[PDB]
Amino acid sequence: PVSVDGETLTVEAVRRVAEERATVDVPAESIAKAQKSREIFEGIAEQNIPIYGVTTGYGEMIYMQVDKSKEVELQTNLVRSHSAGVGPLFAEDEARAIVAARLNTLAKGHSAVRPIILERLAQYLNEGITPAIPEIGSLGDLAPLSHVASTLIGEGYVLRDGRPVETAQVLAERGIEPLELRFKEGLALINGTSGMTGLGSLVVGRALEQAQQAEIVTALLIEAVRGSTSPFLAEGHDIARPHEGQIDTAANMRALMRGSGLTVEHADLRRELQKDKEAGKDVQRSEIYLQKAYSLRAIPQVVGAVRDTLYHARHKLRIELNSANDNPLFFEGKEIFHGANFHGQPIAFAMDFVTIALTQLGVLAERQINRVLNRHLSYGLPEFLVSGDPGLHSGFAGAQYPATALVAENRTIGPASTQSVPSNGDNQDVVSMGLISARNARRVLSNNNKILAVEYLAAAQAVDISGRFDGLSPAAKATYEAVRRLVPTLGVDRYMADDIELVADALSRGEFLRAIARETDIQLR
């Protein structure tokens, strides 16, 4: 059971709830400190004092003073008039991630909403009622959250088997009476960064597994090509260049290739090469490379940088998930706080950063593909991994194209956290566009699975084309089995698409890294 207390929620906890449909539970302490705030706040609204969103207009119309007899109407008109989202609907797991992040915010107890709101949100999550949330509309997350707030009052639509069906039917069809929004209940449900923070959570969490899976195949590839282990020696990171991420990647690469009979140690290389030099010449030509190319050597540096960015992103997400990103806010014997904790800038940046990081992750992946496919760079393999007669057969030559195309496509994605456009009169003169940032990262993450899919296939192909299967380390054989369990070796050439999408979906499921855990005890960082 995932505890949603607005204090200890983690990115992984969110994923379990969103992807694995884990049960959520609001702690009595949270549900209790929520009723209290609600009790005091409610006594404050009875005195018809000025409170944004409770007894005033919304946004620029805050100058419009509204009397307390319009309690339910105000909150409702808001939710209905802001449910103006467009574009595609978020997937079931994405929608759940969003609802979880909102509940956790209210569960912190500073939103002064009735306990039943937290309860009802937790019910939808625990009962499988997913709001149909359109992806576009948020300026960083009113509209997306307005469609959520709708389902609670029996309006809008829910996501049933891929399509949106009126909340009304679904609710009555489940024996649930829609709620009625009281003072500041409508505003609290839609006033925050739950859309970007929810989606962001799923993306960063998955981004991390993609780095681990990038490491896994990169490892298989280095063994199949007989690369040097020198680049990953602890002294070069832990001691010489202590970037957290770099150390982690270097550590995973050493563990993944551990016990390989194909990789070479610097000592052996240096000795093999020295044995190849004649002493009567000042400058000789050797066919041996003491170091391999950047793509098979600078892995710790590049992927480590990626990790560092994903670590910083998860950090900001963790802080945000457990924050009172709502407005206005309530405290003990303190004036009602009128700020802007609904501003997603901290996450908008975080995700724009993740987009850049992941894009470089893909760049690196695609070049390794290029490296194994080019006969002048493969270090001994046949052109484009062709088994039979090259020319007549192209092998993986055609498979490289979609991977190269994706690197270019990912590069056309620009940062969104700086594209603020003034609206609502000029009240919202500076916004973050964070949900666009989150969606950008999601896309590059998705495209990276396709690039990686091509790499996983090329590697396995290079393995049984060089006949180096029996030399692969335990983790290397684990990865190889996992690919063949899905796609067989490439004899004559054939329709590639199905094979790529097959390995791609598996990658998005963490099928690899899951195979390493189940067939070793490599504990991957």
Ligand X SMILES: *N[C@H](c1ccc(OC)cc1)C(F)(F)C(=O)O
Q: Which residue numbers are catalytic? A: 52
- Compute, in degrees rounded to 10, the torsion defined by CA atoms 388, 392, 395, 398: 180
User: Site mask, ligand X, residues 317-346, x = CB under 6 A?
Assistant: ----------x--------------x----
Which of 291, 93, 336, 282 has the alpha carbon at shortest distance from 206?
93
3-class state of residue 256 by DSSP: helix
**348 with 432: CB under 8 angstroms?**
yes
Contact between 281 and a copy of itself per CB under 8 A: yes
- Residue with structure tokens 């100058």? 63
Contact between 198 and a copy of itself per CB under 8 A: no
Contact between 376 and a copy of itself per CB under 8 A: yes
Residue type, 340: A
Contact between 397 and ligand X per CB under 6 A: yes
Is 297 marked as binding a ligand? Answer: yes
CA–CA–CA angle 378, 362, 471 (5° rounding): 40
Q: Identify which of residues 139 and 356 has a Cβ nearer to ligand X in the complex.
A: 139
Question: Which residues are paired to 159 by β-bridges?
Answer: 164
Choices 12-20, 31-39, 178-186, 397-405 (CB under 8 A): range interacting with a copy of itself: 397-405
Q: Identify which of residues 40 and 64 has a Cβ nearer to a copy of itself in the complex.
A: 64
Q: Identify which of residues 17 and 317 has a Cβ nearer to a copy of itself in the complex.
A: 317
Choices 196-204, 364-372, 459-467, 511-519 (CB under 8 A): range interacting with a copy of itself: 364-372
Is 485 marked as binding a ligand? Answer: no
Contact between 454 and ligand X per CB under 6 A: no
User: Do the strands 134-136 and 86-89 form a parallel or antiparallel pair, or are they unpaired?
Assistant: antiparallel
Q: Identify which of residues 241 and 518 has a Cβ nearer to a copy of itself in the complex.
A: 241
For residue 391, give Cα distances in angstroms to 23, 309, 334, 341, 457. Answer: 56, 43, 78, 62, 20
Angle, nearest 10°, between helix axes 244-256 and 474-484?
A: 80
In the complex, least distance from residue 321 CB atom to ligand X, rounded to whole angstroms: 19
Q: Which of 424, 469, 474, 510 binds ligand X (CB under 6 A)?
A: 424
Q: Which of a copy of itself, ligand X, none lies near 318, with the C-beta cut-off 5 to 8 A by kind? A: none
Q: Identify which of residues 74 and 118 has a Cβ nearer to a copy of itself in the complex.
A: 74
Q: Which of a copy of itself, ligand X, none lies near 191, with the C-beta cut-off 5 to 8 A by kind? A: ligand X
Contact between 371 and a copy of itself per CB under 8 A: yes
Residue nearest to ligand X (CB): 59
Angle, nearest 10°, between helix axes 434-466 and 400-411?
A: 160
Q: Which of a copy of itself, ligand X, none lies near 387, with the C-beta cut-off 5 to 8 A by kind? A: none
Q: Which residues have C-beta within 8 Å of that of residue 11, sequence separation ≥ 6? A: 201, 204, 205, 314, 317, 318, 321
Question: Residues in contact with a copy of itself, total (CB under 8 A)?
Answer: 189
Site for a copy of itself in 31-50 (CB under 8 A): 48-50
* Alpha-carbon radius of gyration of the chain: 27
Under the phi-then-psi rule, with left for phi > 0, alpha for psi from -120 to 50, and beta for the rest, what region is 56?
beta
Site for ligand X in 196-255 (CB under 6 A): none
Q: Which of 233, 264, 486, 517 binds a copy of itself (CB under 8 A)?
A: 233
Contact between 352 and a copy of itself per CB under 8 A: yes
**460 with 489: CB under 8 angstroms?**
yes
- Residue with structure tokens 């770099």? 246
Choices 2-10, 392-400, 407-415, 497-505 (CB under 6 A): range interacting with ligand X: 392-400
Classify the C-alpha dihedral 396-397-403-407 as positive or negative: positive
Is 191 marked as binding a ligand? Answer: yes
Q: Which residues have C-beta within 8 Å of that of residue 211, sequence separation ≥ 6? A: 249, 303, 306, 307, 310, 361
DSSP H/E element including 123: helix 115-127
Contact between 440 and a copy of itself per CB under 8 A: yes
**338 with 188: CB under 8 angstroms?**
no
Contact between 58 and ligand X per CB under 6 A: yes
Q: Which of 179, 264, 298, 486 binds a copy of itself (CB under 8 A)?
A: 298
Site for a copy of itself in 50-109 (CB under 8 A): 50-52, 56-67, 69-70, 73-74, 77-78, 80-87, 108
Q: Which of 153, 217, 324, 513 binds a copy of itself (CB under 8 A)?
A: 324
Q: Which residues are annotated as a binding site?
A: 82, 191, 297
Q: Which residues are annotated as a binding site for substrate?
A: 82, 191, 297
Site residues (vs ligand X, CB under 6 A): 53, 58-59, 82, 142, 191, 327, 342, 394, 397-398, 424
